[PDB]
Design a protein around this motif. Structure first.
Motif, PDB file in Angstrom:
ATOM      1  N   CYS A  42       4.405   0.561   1.870  1.00 23.92           N
ATOM      2  CA  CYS A  42       4.516  -0.374   2.992  1.00 23.92           C
ATOM      3  C   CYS A  42       3.931  -1.693   2.591  1.00 23.92           C
ATOM      4  CB  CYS A  42       3.778   0.107   4.223  1.00 23.92           C
ATOM      5  SG  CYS A  42       4.295   1.729   4.803  1.00 23.92           S
ATOM      6  N   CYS A  91       5.966   3.030   8.135  1.00 26.12           N
ATOM      7  CA  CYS A  91       5.494   1.663   7.930  1.00 26.12           C
ATOM      8  C   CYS A  91       5.460   0.897   9.249  1.00 26.12           C
ATOM      9  CB  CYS A  91       6.345   0.928   6.885  1.00 26.12           C
ATOM     10  SG  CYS A  91       6.272   1.687   5.259  1.00 26.12           S
ATOM     11  N   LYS A 141       0.855  -1.186   0.000  1.00 30.48           N
ATOM     12  CA  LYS A 141       0.000   0.000   0.000  1.00 30.48           C
ATOM     13  C   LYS A 141       0.884   1.227   0.000  1.00 30.48           C
ATOM     14  CE  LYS A 141      -3.790   2.646   1.256  1.00 30.48           C
ATOM     15  NZ  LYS A 141      -4.702   2.655   2.416  1.00 30.48           N
ATOM     16  N   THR A 142       0.687   2.111  -0.972  1.00 29.75           N
ATOM     17  CA  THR A 142       1.462   3.353  -0.987  1.00 29.75           C
ATOM     18  C   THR A 142       0.758   4.459  -0.204  1.00 29.75           C
ATOM     19  OG1 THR A 142       2.661   4.985  -2.312  1.00 29.75           O
ATOM     20  CG2 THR A 142       0.632   4.170  -3.276  1.00 29.75           C
TER      21      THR A 142
END
Ligand SMILES: O=C(O)C(=O)C[C@@H]1O[C@H](CO)[C@@H](O)[C@@H]1O[C@H]1O[C@H]([C@@H](O)CO)[C@@H](O)[C@H](O[C@H]2O[C@H]([C@@H](O)CO)[C@@H](O)[C@H](O)[C@@H]2O)[C@@H]1O
Ligand SMILES: O=C(O)C(=O)C[C@@H]1O[C@H](CO)[C@@H](O)[C@@H]1O[C@H]1O[C@H]([C@@H](O)CO)[C@@H](O)[C@H](O[C@H]2O[C@H]([C@@H](O)CO)[C@@H](O)[C@H](O)[C@@H]2O)[C@@H]1O
Ligand code: CA
Ligand code: CA
Ligand code: CA
Ligand code: CA
Ligand code: CA
Ligand code: CA
Ligand code: CA
Ligand code: CA
Ligand code: CA
Lengths: 152, 151, 151
Positions: free
Chosen positions: A150, A58, A43-44
């Motif tokens: 992350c 993260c 997931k950005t």
């Protein structure tokens, strides 16, 4: 004993509805900033940070920086990098021992996708790793700002 | 007699669902949310005046951020720090000046006022913002601040 | 009655999961999603040309917003109003000019054209956008509009 029959059946229906509903929400949730691959999700955050700040984000969110451990994981991560058109930091560094890249656990790499000539420790000061829009990796100075992605 | 094997199976399904849901919940909260106890804060990631912010939260099925403890306040402070923008809380003293209440009308059970606050500055500060240091300041409701809803 | 104990434990887990899931739905939909019936609309919050928008939705496991009733259209309209940017729909008359179809090839079962539309302006409008008033307009596929997918 016939009472436990009906309760098991009523729960089967509730479980089925939850499964169906959740399957829909998985797709919704990962649009547009996530990618599922096997049991892993990337997931950005959609923004850039230097490595230390990215790593902290993260870890504070209960994950870790993107750590692709196969071609398939690397290609899934690459889709996000392409979509945001910005290279991303991976989790791995050779900060401890120069030339030897490790995961945050200390474990040696089980997969790499280095661009030709990399890692090159350019200027004697590249200890982090970035993934390009073509999926290839390059060692990069940890102070530079790259896409935060992350894994969970 | 062999409901056993359905119950063992259904339990495997539920535990797999718990595990997947738990993962998807962490994903959901990164990077615009924070969980604290049973409460979830989520920012919209933009600013609005108070009445518009409040409407957005109520229409989403929540309410504006309403920290009721130091732990909830610290969790909200993480979002404000991340976006580097002060956020509106739910509470106002619109009904009785100097008396801040939740949207239910209940009086505050927790506060974290900055030194000198609340001051009703300008004679018209009936909303509350939380700063990047976690301290609270009463603020004019017409000003635009970060929208953070609690669920 | 050893099962009776394990069923009561399982019931607790399912009820907890139902409540957690319902909360999580609200969180997920805030602020870029809308649920209507069994359909969910979600905006990416940025603009793209049609072909790129269409690919983004299909690769995410959905498709471009395809409202099939007034209720679906109104749900979509809320997202368009919130972003203040007109959005692409899935439907096109790329195959047969003046005949708009879903990506399946099926002809429209619902429409909400603005007055005068569709007008094929400049002989080159084969995509459809929805305005902030909810009305539809045919638009050139190369223009950039809000990406909204349905799941
Ligand atoms: O934007 C970047 O990629 C850079 O940071 C480029 C940098 O520019 C300088 C060029 O001499 C040098 O400091 C650095 O380029 C070296 O490092 C790059 C990356 O490893 C940085 O992490 C390499 O991509 C680059 O290789 C390319 O240029 C060289 C030389 O022409 C110049 O050094 C070529 O031999 C090579 O094939 C690449 O075209 C270089 O090692
Ligand atoms: O953003 C747009 O609407 C346009 O794309 C404007 C374009 O400007 C040119 C005007 O001559 C023409 O190429 C195009 O406008 C026509 O097409 C529009 C859309 O169908 C494009 O897909 C219409 O929206 C536009 O009509 C609008 O303006 C007229 C004028 O009277 C100005 O007020 C109104 O009659 C109409 O109600 C619309 O408000 C026009 O048909
Ligand atoms: Ca070094
Ligand atoms: Ca190095
Ligand atoms: Ca390098
Ligand atoms: Ca007042
Ligand atoms: Ca006041
Ligand atoms: Ca004040
Ligand atoms: Ca045409
Ligand atoms: Ca046309
Ligand atoms: Ca038109």
């Amino acid at each position: 004993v016939a009472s436990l029959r009906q309760q098991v059946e009523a729960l089967q229906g509730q479980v089925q509805h939850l499964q169906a509903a959740f399957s829909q929400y998985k797709k919704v949730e990962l649009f547009p900033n996530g990618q599922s691959v096997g049991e892993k999700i990337f997931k950005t955050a959609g923004f850039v940070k230097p490595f230390t700040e990215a790593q902290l984000l993260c870890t504070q969110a209960g994950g870790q920086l993107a750590s692709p451990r196969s071609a398939a994981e690397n290609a899934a991560l690459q889709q996000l990098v392409v979509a945001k058109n910005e290279a991303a930091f991976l989790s791995m560094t050779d900060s401890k021992t120069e030339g030897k890249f490790t995961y945050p656990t200390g474990e040696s790499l089980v997969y790499s996708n280095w661009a030709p000539g990399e890692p090159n420790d350019d200027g004697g000061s590249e200890d982090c790793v970035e993934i390009f829009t073509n999926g290839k990796w390059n060692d990069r100075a940890c102070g530079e700002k790259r896409l935060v992605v992350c894994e969970f």
